[PDB]
Amino acid sequence: TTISPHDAQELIARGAKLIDIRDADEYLREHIPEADLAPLSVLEQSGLPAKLRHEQIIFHCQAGKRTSNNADKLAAIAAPAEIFLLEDGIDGWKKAGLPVAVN
Numbered sequence: 001t002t003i004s005p006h007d008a009q010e011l012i013a014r015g016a017k018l019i020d021i022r023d024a025d026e027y028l029r030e031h032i033p034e035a036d037l038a039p040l041s042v043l044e045q046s047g048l049p050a051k052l053r054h055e056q057i058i059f060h061c062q063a064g065k066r067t068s069n070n071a072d073k074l075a076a077i078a079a080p081a082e083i084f085l086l087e088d089g090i091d092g093w094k095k096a097g098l099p100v101a102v103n
Contacts, residue, residue: 001084001085002064002084002085005095005096008058011058016055016056017052017053017054018086019036019038020037020060020090021040021066022037022061028103030102031101032099033101035060038052040061040073048078056081056082057083058086059085059086060089061089061090062089064088064091065089067086
């Protein structure tokens with residue numbers, strides 16, 4: 001299931017984890033302040049660490065593609081949470097007028 005940036009904000013205000021699945025170099029250039037970084041490759045190797053588990057988990061990447069294309073991987077990695085994909089990624093978040101942190 002996809003979630004709008006504004007609806008994601010409301011879930012994050014209730015404790016939902018926002019997980020950035022991009023690489024560290026991408027994150028460092030520009031990220032969502034509320035997000036926790038966990039590159040997809042690392043998640044595929046060692047799983048989601050306990051500190052990033054919650055009842056509600058929202059994954060995001062750049063523009064919606066890596067989340068859409070790895071939907072089954074992400075559904076398993078965060079199971080048994082309620083899982084969302086941020087619609088249009090950080091690009092969508094920016095287009096919605098929500099804050100980002102730029103290097």
